[PDB]
């Protein structure tokens, strides 16, 4: 069981021929069933196409990612989510479906996921993707001004905009801005710094700062755990009343 014509099945198609038509692009993705939202930018050579299911979009992406057409090699990638939110400070005992139910009060939720580790235990963060931007704006606003509780325990969740990161295409060398700082940084190739050299001293002092920052961050963790446990005891003590 899946949801159809969601933003997660919407593909960005770049490096198109300049004379491309809506019918020409619909014939390209003919194999992958019917298409919905079809956008095409006359100049710049790019557009969007929404396929019925995410599995169909995943197949179309791999089968056409660098397929050459009219001399140019196409660029097929998943389009960025305009209504994605990150939810932290999740309760212990949470689920994807609990988030889908909770955030559905703000608008149509396309997908909600509880981020888990290699052992299946939640990491404390979650993702909530809405159908459209105003529903995500409503959730962001209401959850900051009010206290959104998902479970019996009265611990409000933290709802923030999603910081979208690309760990797939990343930063290719062709895309790096070749400015003065770039050429300065590239004068020296990757190497191990020699003990007693200027670079060695500098790098060891940098390592010291990176380690000092980790110790300072560990201290914040200690302060919040100590304060959290004081509040958790007070909450447990107050329940014995009224």
């Amino acid at each position: 069981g899946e949801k159809t014509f969601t933003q997660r099945s919407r593909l960005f198609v770049g490096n198109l021929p300049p004379d491309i038509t809506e019918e020409e692009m619909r014939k390209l993705f003919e194999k992958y069933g019917k298409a919905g939202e079809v956008f095409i930018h006359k100049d710049k050579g790019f557009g969007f196409i929404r396929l019925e299911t995410r599995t169909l979009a995943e197949i179309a992406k791999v089968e056409l990612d660098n397929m050459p057409l009219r001399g140019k090699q196409l660029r097929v990638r998943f389009a960025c989510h305009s209504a994605s939110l990150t939810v932290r400070n999740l309760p212990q005992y949470v689920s994807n479906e609990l988030l889908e139910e909770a955030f559905s009060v703000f608008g149509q939720v396309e997908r909600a996921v509880v981020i888990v580790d290699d052992r299946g235990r939640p990491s404390g963060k979650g993702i909530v993707e809405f159908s459209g931007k105003p529903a995500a704006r409503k959730a962001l606003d209401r959850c900051s001004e009010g206290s959104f509780l998902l479970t019996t325990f009265p611990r409000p969740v933290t709802v923030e905009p999603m910081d979208q990161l690309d760990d797939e295409e990343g930063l290719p060398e062709k895309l790096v801005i070749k400015n003065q700082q770039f050429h300065k940084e590239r004068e020296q190739p990757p190497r191990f710094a020699q003990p007693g050299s200027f670079e060695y001293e500098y790098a060891m002092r940098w390592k010291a700062l990176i380690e000092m920052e980790k110790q300072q961050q560990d201290q914040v963790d200690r302060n919040i755990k100590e304060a959290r446990e004081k509040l958790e005891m007070e909450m447990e003590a107050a329940r014995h009343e009224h």
Binding site: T55, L98, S147, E185, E201, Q217, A227
Partner: protein, 239 residues
Amino acid sequence: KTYTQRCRLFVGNLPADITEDEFKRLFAKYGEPGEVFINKGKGFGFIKLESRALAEIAKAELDDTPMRGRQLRVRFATHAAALSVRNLSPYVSNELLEEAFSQFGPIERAVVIVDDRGRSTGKGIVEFASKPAARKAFERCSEGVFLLTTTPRPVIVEPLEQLDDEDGLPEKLAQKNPMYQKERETPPRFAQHGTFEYEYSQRWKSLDEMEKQQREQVEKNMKDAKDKLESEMEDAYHE
């Protein structure tokens, strides 16, 4: 190139009477099967495919395909030799990262993670062909100082922390714990003013505000320290 650890697919929720040839028959259309392992007991197995492209289609085509009452779970197998590199110069590309770490062993993939605007987040991922190569890379960059650019900022290699943000924690699995059902007794709501919930949820908001205040101050402290270091080195370079 062919049959890398990036082509290894994990399949969970396999039926009880699963055979090695039966598991191979599932992925018959995706060319010749590679290394196939099955833990008949715990109901899971692994299968390597010729290419990451074939593996991606197989994952897409089977991620929730039912097989004898069971809803199969097909995901890419966890990379045993994956490392996280941080403190990267914004001028280190995926290609430069690969060239740099290739001196430790053969590399399957090296990526520099970028933000919503394509700018280097200062972090990357290096997936090695072998676990001892990743161990060699981790040991040498921690013992010594590894520099990728002219600026002497050392790369901070750590073993990669793998997080799942596609499958997640579904209700069918979460509701197995009776404490999840006890917690779901109250539905998601907004803490109403003048209740036990409103009083204490305000205290959590203040504690969260303090956590924010502290974390922002730590990054400010680190910023002035990196600036002070940069300034103290310009004076020391002139001997």
